[PDB]
Amino acid sequence: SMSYTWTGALITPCAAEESKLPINPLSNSLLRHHNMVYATTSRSASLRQKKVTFDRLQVLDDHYRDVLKEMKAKASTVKAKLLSIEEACKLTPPHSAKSKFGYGAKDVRNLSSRAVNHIRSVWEDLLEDTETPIDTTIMAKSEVFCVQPGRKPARLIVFPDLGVRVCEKMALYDVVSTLPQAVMGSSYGFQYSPKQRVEFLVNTWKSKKCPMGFSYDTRCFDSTVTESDIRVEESIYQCCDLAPEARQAIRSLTERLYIGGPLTNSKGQNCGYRRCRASGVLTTSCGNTLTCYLKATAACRAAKLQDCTMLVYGDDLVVICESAGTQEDAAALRAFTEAMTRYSAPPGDPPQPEYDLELITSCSSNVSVAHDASGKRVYYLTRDPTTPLARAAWETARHTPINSWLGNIIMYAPTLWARMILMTHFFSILLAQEQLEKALDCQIYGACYSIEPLDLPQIIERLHGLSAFTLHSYSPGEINRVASCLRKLGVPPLRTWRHRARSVRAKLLSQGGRAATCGRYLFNWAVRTKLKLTPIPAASQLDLSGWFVAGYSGGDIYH
Numbered sequence: 054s055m056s057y058t059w060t061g062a063l064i065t066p067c068a069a070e071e072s073k074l075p076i077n078p079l080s081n082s083l084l085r086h087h088n089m090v091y092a093t094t095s096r097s098a099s100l101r102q103k104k105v106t107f108d109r110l111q112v113l114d115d116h117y118r119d120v121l122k123e124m125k126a127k128a129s130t131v132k133a134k135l136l137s138i139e140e141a142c143k144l145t146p147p148h149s150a151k152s153k154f155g156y157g158a159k160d161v162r163n164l165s166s167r168a169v170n171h172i173r174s175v176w177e178d179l180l181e182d183t184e185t186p187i188d189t190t191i192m193a194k195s196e197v198f199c200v201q202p203g204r205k206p207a208r209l210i211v212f213p214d215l216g217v218r219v220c221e222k223m224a225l226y227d228v229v230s231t232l233p234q235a236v237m238g239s240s241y242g243f244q245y246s247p248k249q250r251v252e253f254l255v256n257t258w259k260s261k262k263c264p265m266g267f268s269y270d271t272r273c274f275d276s277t278v279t280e281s282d283i284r285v286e287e288s289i290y291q292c293c294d295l296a297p298e299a300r301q302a303i304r305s306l307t308e309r310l311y312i313g314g315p316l317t318n319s320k321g322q323n324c325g326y327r328r329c330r331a332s333g334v335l336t337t338s339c340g341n342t343l344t345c346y347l348k349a350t351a352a353c354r355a356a357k358l359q360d361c362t363m364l365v366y367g368d369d370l371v372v373i374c375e376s377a378g379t380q381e382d383a384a385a386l387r388a389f390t391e392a393m394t395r396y397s398a399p400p401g402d403p404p405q406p407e408y409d410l411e412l413i414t415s416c417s418s419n420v421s422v423a424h425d426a427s428g429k430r431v432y433y434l435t436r437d438p439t440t441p442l443a444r445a446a447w448e449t450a451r452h453t454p455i456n457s458w459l460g461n462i463i464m465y466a467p468t469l470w471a472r473m474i475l476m477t478h479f480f481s482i483l484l485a486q487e488q489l490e491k492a493l494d495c496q497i498y499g500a501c502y503s504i505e506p507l508d509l510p511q512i513i514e515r516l517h518g519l520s521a522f523t524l525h526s527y528s529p530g531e532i533n534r535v536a537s538c539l540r541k542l543g544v545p546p547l548r549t550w551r552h553r554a555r556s557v558r559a560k561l562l563s564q565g566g567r568a569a570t571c572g573r574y575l576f577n578w579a580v581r582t583k584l585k586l587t588p589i590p591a592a593s594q595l596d597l598s599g600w601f602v603a604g605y606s607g608g609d610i611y612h
């Protein structure tokens with residue numbers, strides 16, 4: 054079966070599409086090579102349509118079936134609740150795509166009678182009709198990148214109407230929030246804050262006599278997900294204790310939405326048919342994580358990899374195991390790839406065995422080492438800053454729904470690039486515009502959060518510990534990756550950022566209050582006569598319940 058079939062109608066935009074970085078003094082202070090930065094548009098959609106459209110080979114074996122039974126035995130411990138209409142409505146992002154049936158996200162959030170009435174009729178239709186395919190919209194996603202030494206085509210998103218999305222929450226929010234950890238335990242990546250993630254990786258690595266690890270990159274994961282995969286996923290959901298309406302909603306959503314369905318473009322034209330995972334549904338993250346875990350765990354057994362520990366974030370997979378020696382690891386890994394290939398999940402680039410933890414990439418990130426105020430080694434996660442910086446420049450010049458920069462500051466807070474460049478740049482702008490107090494939207498593990506920049510110190514402390522504000526003596530490799538990135542993009546060198554930060558820090562300290570705390574903690578690296586930093590009282594008091602429970606990419610979730 055084909056992942057997609059197409060009619061010939063175009064994937065169309067619903068408004069003008071910007072593709073060039075504007076020439077703006079605020080973005081230009083950060084990044085001068087503006088022609089290197091682009092945004093994708095619907096104009097490249099057909100290139101992506103070609104990449105994501107292919108026949109799927111799938112042969113299931115005893116290892117797969119054994120693993121699946123083990124996962125279902127754990128799912129059987131779960132009791133999931135049906136969410137009320139009110140709770141589902143309050144999970145809807147304020148700017149979520151309006152319904153085609155005369156109401157939008159604001160109305161959903163306000164519980165207006167039209168929205169509520171339409172959501173109830175959608176729920177009742179899920180209970181009564183177990184087969185009719187549910188409509189979806191296909192759109193090209195606009196994302197910002199740096200040009201390569203050419204251009205990435207737009208990614209495609211597929212999502213159902215607002216009424217359906219609210220019903221998905223009712224039936225499945227509790228399931229997708231609870232079941233993955235119940236099934237996958239320590240392997241489930243969305244449960245970990247950044248410090249907890251680094252500790253898991255480092256401890257797993259140090260728990261092996263002679264560790265070997267690898268990442269495994271599936272080509273076009275969503276498109277490799279077969280109808281069988283999606284029914285297997287439902288078989289796992291169905292092991293939960295479920296309200297009978299939830300049980301029917303899940304069965305109906307699985308047949309009418311998740312397995313596939315018709316695609317309509319923005320103009321209302323029939324565009325094609327999907328027989329693979331939709332990116333824009335509540336179960337995308339959970340389903341992808343279960344599927345990846347199932348396939349990878351069974352393939353580890355087929356390959357005879359010894360004492361495997363996996364970390365899974367949707368389609369993103371890392372495996373750390375005991376080395377059997379260079380040649381035998383190389384052979385085992387190739388056997389792993391062939392087993393995954395049989396399960397429909399062939400690799401983009403063949404996986405490579407790695408004998409150094411810092412050379413393994415999970416979620417484009419690697420572990421690196423710096424030192425705290427006392428000289429003690431601290432492990433932290435980092436990445437190549439090229440895409441974060443390109444995106445930060447875009448978001449400086451253009452008001453954007455989700456601020457990637459804020460997510461990058463929060464999650465990569467210990468890195469030299471987030472600290473020296475992103476904090477300096479964005480605090481400088483917020484100070485000048487007197488917007489330090491204005492709540493901004495970002496996305497953390499797929500969910501949308503509204504965050505005030507002035508709360509950053511206590512958010513960073515909780516997620517990373519106080520060492521985040523004292524790291525120094527970064528590794529030569531990391532320094533040289535940042536420095537070469539800055540040269541490439543026309544970003545001023547680190548010495549310039551140090552000068553700018555000292556100025557920002559003084560203005561913050563002069564303001565007192567929460568702004569002075571930002572100066573003291575976020576910019577202590579900028580001064581030689583350091584302030585002695587103690588736990589922020591507000592940190593222990595922060596409600597970070599629901600931060601690192603699950604992933605919700607594509608799932609239209611707001612907290």
Ligand SMILES: CCO[P@]1(=O)N=C(C2=C(O)[C@H](C(C)(C)C)N(CCC(C)(C)C)C2=O)Nc2ccc(NS(C)(=O)=O)cc21
Pocket residue numbers: 246247250337338339341342366367368369415416418434460461464465496497498499500604605606
């Ligand atoms: C696509 C973005 O949504 P996700 O839930 N979010 C992340 C994720 C983060 O939120 C952050 C952020 C920097 C983008 C803010 N980031 C870095 C986290 C780390 C510092 C602990 C390594 C992520 O990987 N990482 C993700 C990784 C894989 C998937 N796979 S999927 C589409 O099958 O659900 C999804 C996600």
